[PDB]
Structures are given as structure tokens and as C-alpha cells.
mmCIF file of C-alpha atoms (C1' of nucleotides) in Angstrom:
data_model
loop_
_atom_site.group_PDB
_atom_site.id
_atom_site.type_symbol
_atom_site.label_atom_id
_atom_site.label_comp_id
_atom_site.label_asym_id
_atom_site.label_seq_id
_atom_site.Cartn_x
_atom_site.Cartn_y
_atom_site.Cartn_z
ATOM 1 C CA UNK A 1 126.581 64.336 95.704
ATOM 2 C CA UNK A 2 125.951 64.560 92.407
ATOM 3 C CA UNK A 3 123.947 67.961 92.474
ATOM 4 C CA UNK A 4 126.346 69.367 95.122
ATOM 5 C CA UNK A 5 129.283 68.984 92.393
ATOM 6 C CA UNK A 6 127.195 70.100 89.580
ATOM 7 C CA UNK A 7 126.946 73.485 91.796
ATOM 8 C CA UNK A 8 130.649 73.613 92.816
ATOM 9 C CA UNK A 9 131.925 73.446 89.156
ATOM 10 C CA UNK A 10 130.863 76.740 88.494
ATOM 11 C CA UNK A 11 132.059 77.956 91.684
ATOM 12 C CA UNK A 12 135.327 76.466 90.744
ATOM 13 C CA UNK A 13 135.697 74.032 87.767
ATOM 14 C CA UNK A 14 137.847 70.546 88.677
ATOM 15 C CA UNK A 15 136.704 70.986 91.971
ATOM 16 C CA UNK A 16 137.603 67.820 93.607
ATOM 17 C CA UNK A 17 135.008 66.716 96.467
ATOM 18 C CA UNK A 18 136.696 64.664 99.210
ATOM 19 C CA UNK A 19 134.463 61.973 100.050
ATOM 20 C CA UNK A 20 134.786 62.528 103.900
ATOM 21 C CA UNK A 21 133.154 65.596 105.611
ATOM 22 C CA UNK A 22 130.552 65.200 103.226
ATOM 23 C CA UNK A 23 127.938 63.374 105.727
ATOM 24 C CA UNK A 24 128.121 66.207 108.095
ATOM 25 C CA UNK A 25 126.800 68.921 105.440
ATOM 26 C CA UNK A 26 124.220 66.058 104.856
ATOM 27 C CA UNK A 27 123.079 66.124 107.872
ATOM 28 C CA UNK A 28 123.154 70.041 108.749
ATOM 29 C CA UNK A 29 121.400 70.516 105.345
ATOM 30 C CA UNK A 30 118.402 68.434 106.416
ATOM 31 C CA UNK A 31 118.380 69.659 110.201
ATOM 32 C CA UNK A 32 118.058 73.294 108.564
ATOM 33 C CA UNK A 33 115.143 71.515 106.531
ATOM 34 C CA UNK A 34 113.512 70.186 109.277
ATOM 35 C CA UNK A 35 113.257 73.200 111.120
ATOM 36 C CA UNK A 36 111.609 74.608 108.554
ATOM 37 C CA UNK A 37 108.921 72.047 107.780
ATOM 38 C CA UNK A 38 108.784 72.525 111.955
ATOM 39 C CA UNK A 39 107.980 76.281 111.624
ATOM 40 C CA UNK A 40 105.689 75.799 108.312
ATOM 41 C CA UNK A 41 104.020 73.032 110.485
ATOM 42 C CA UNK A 42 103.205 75.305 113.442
ATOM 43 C CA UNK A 43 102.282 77.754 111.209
ATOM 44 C CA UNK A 44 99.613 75.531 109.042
ATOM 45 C CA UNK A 45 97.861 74.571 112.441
ATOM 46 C CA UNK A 46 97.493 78.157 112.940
ATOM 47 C CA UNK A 47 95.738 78.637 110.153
ATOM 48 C CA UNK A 48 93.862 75.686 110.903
ATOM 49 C CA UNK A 49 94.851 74.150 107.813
ATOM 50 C CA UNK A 50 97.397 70.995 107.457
ATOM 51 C CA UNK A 51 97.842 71.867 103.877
ATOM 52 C CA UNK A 52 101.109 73.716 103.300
ATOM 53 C CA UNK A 53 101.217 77.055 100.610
ATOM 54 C CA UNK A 54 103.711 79.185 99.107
ATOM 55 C CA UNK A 55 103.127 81.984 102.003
ATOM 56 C CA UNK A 56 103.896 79.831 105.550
ATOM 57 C CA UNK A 57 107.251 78.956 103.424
ATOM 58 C CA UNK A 58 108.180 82.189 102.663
ATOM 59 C CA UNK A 59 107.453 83.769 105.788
ATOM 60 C CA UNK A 60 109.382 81.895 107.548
ATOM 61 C CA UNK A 61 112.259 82.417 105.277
ATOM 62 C CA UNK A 62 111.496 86.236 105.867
ATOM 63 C CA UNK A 63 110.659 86.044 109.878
ATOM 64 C CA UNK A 64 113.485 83.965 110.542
ATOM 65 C CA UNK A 65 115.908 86.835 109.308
ATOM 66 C CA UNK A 66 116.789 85.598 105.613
ATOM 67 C "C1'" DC B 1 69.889 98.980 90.617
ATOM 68 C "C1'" DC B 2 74.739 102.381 91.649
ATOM 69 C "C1'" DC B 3 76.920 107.804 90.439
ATOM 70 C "C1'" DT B 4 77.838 112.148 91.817
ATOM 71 C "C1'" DG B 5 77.494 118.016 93.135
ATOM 72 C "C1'" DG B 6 78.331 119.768 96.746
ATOM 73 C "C1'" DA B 7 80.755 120.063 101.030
ATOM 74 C "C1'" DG B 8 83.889 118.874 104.831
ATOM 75 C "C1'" DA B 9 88.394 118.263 105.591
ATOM 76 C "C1'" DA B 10 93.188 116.521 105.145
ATOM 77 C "C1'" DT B 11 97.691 117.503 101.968
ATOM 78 C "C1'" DC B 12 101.463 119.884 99.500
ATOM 79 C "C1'" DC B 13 103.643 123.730 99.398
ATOM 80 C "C1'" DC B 14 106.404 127.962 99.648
ATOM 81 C "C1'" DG B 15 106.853 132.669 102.207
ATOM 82 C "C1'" DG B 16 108.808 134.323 106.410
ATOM 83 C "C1'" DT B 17 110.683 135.319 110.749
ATOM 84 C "C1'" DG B 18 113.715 133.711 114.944
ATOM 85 C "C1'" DC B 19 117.295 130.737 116.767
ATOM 86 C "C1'" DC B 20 121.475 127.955 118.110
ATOM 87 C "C1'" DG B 21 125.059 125.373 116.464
ATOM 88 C "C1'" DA B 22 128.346 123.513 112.207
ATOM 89 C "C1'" DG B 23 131.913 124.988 110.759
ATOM 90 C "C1'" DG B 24 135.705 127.846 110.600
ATOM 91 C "C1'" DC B 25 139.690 129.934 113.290
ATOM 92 C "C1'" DC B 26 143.262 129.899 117.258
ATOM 93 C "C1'" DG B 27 146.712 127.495 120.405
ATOM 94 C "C1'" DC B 28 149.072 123.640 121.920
ATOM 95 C "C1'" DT B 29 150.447 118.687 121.253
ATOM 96 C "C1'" DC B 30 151.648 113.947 121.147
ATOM 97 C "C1'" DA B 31 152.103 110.093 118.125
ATOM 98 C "C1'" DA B 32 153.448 108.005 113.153
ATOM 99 C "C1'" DT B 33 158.012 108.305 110.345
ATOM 100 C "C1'" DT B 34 162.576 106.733 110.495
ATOM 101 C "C1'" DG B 35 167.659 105.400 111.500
ATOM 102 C "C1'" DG B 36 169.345 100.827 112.986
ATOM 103 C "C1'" DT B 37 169.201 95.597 114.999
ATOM 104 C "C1'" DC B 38 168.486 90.530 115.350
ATOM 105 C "C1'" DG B 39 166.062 86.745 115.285
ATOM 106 C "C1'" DT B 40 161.230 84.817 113.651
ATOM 107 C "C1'" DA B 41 158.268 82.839 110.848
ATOM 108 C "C1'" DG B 42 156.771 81.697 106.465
ATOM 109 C "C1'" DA B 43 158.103 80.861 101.237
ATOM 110 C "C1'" DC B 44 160.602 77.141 98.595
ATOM 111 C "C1'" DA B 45 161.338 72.611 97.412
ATOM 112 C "C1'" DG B 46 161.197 67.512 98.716
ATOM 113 C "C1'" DC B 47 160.101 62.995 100.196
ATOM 114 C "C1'" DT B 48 156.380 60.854 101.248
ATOM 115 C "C1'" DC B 49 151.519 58.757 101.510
ATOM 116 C "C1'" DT B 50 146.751 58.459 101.010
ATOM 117 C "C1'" DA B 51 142.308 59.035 99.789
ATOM 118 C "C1'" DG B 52 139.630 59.228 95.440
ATOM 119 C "C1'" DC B 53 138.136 58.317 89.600
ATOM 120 C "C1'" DA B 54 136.653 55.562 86.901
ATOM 121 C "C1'" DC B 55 135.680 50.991 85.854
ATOM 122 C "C1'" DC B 56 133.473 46.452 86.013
ATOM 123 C "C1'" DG B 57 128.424 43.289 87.208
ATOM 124 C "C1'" DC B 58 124.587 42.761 90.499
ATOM 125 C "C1'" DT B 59 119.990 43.769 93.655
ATOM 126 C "C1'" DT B 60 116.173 44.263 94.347
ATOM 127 C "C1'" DA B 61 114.895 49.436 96.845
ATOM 128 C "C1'" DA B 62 112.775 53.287 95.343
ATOM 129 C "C1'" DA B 63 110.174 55.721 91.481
ATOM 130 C "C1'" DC B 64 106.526 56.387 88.605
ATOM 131 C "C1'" DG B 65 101.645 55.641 86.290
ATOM 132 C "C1'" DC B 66 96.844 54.306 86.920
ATOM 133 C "C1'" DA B 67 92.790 54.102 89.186
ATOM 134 C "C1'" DC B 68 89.757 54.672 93.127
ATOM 135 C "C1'" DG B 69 88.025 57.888 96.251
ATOM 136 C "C1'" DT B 70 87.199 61.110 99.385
ATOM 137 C "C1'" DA B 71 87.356 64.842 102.351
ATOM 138 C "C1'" DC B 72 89.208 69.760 103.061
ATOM 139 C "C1'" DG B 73 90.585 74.780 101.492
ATOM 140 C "C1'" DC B 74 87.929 77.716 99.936
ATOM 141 C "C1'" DG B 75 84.087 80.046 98.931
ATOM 142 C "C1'" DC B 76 78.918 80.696 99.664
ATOM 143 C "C1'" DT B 77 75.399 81.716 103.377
ATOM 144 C "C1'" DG B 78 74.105 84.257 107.958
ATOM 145 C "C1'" DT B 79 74.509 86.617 112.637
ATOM 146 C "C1'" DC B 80 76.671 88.904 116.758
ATOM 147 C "C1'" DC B 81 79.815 91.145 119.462
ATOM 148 C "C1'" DC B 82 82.953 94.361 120.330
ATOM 149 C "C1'" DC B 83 85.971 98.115 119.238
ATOM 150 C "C1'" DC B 84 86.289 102.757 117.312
ATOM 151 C "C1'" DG B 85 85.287 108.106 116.880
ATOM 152 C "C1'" DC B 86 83.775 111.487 119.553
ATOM 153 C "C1'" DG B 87 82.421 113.857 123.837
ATOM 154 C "C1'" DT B 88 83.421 114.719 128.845
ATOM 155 C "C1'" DT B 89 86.475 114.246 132.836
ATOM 156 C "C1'" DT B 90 90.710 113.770 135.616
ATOM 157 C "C1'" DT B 91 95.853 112.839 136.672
ATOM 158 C "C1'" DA B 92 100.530 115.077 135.192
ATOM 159 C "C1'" DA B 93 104.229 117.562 134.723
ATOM 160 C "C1'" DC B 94 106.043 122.933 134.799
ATOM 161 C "C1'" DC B 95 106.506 127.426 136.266
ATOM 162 C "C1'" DG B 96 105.651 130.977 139.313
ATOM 163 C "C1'" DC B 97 105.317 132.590 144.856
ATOM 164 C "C1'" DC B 98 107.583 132.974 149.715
ATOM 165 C "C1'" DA B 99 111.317 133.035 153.748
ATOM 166 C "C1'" DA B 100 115.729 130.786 155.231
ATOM 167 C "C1'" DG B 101 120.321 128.776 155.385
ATOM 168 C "C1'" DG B 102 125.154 127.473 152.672
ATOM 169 C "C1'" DG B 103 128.614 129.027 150.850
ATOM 170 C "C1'" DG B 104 131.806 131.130 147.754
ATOM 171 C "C1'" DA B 105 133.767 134.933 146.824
ATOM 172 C "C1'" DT B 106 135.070 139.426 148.362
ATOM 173 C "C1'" DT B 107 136.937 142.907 150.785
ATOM 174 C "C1'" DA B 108 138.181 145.338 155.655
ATOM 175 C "C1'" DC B 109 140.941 145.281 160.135
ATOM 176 C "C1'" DT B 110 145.023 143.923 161.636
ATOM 177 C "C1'" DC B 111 149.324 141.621 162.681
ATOM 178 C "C1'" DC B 112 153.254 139.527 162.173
ATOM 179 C "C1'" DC B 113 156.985 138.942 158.083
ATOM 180 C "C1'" DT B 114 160.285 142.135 156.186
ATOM 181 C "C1'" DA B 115 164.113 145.472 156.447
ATOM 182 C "C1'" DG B 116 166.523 150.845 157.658
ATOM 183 C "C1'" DT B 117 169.932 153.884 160.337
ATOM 184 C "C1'" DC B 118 171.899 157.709 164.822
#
DNA sequence: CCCTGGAGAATCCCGGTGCCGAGGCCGCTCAATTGGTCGTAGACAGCTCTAGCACCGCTTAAACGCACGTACGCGCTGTCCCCCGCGTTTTAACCGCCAAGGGGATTACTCCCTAGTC
């Protein structure tokens, strides 16, 4: 909450954050997340390696389409 | 040990001629402006009400350092297997050949539609 403010004062200073609504982006943040920890996963095991490096991560920010 | 003169060959590039179509020009042409209405929906408060800002003291739940420790990503070794460049062969569209209808126009015979006067 704290870090989400911090990033919607510059956005728009005094921005008051209503403290409902809130869980939902919580929870479509980390679904997003997982699904990408899901994809780096998949892609570690095929590089037979359960290590994750900078290049699964940004491939699949690139492959995905953003 | 590793570097290169020569050679083979791919690249960049501007003359240098032929083509077909981008753009201009011509002739309609139909749809955005504009007069009005009349009534619709959103701006302007206005009363209300409702969730949040900051505050207080706790509670151990997470967070972080330290130390062990240990095994895996990566880099070394080797082989092996399989795919490419080139040489030879075969499907694969494309354009000519022929004699016959189909038909669309095109014109010839004619035949009824039209219209004149002793």
C-alpha cells in the first residue's frame, strides 16, 4: 500500500487511495506474477537448469507480447 | 605455432532501354450546411452520509546476520552422427497444335404496320 501510493503521488499528488478495491489489484498483481515465475519455470527445465537468469525473465516479457 | 598473395566469387552501383499505371482531366452527383422546432439530458447547487487519516499501545510474525555445507551452472575434456553443398534426376505448370459447336452480332428476305387518292 505503501509503495502503490508512493507511485500514485506523482501520477497525481493528494491522491487519496480508498481502502476497498484495493485487494483485487492485490491479487491480479500476483496472478500476473505467478504466471510468470510459471513460464520462467517451464523455461528453466528446458534448459535443464532450475536456476533462474536474467534471459528466461526477459524473454518471456518479450514472447509474451510486452 | 598462425598470416597472407593470390584467386574465386558475392556486392554496390549507376547507365539504359521498355512498360503500364498514377495522376491529371472530364462529366455527373448526392450528401453536409442551414432555416426552424421541442423536448432531453446534463451542468449547477444542495442535503446528506460514509468511508478513511492519523493517532494511541501491543504481539510476537517476519527479517536479517552468521555459519555450515554442498552440489550445480558452467566450463574443461572427448567422440559421433547427421545435415549441408553440390551433382543428377524427375514432377509441374504454360504455351502452342487441331477440329467442332455456341452464340452473339449482323445483315438479307419479307411481311405486315402505315397511309394516299379517282
Amino acid at each position: 500500500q505503501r509503495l502503490v501510493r508512493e507511485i500514485a503521488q506523482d501520477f497525481k499528488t493528494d491522491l487519496r487511495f480508498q481502502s476497498s478495491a484495493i485487494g483485487a489489484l492485490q491479487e491480479s498483481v500476483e496472478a500476473y506474477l505467478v504466471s510468470l515465475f510459471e513460464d520462467t519455470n517451464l523455461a528453466a527445465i528446458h534448459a535443464k537448469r532450475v536456476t533462474i537468469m536474467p534471459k528466461e525473465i526477459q524473454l518471456a516479457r518479450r514472447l509474451r507480447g510486452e
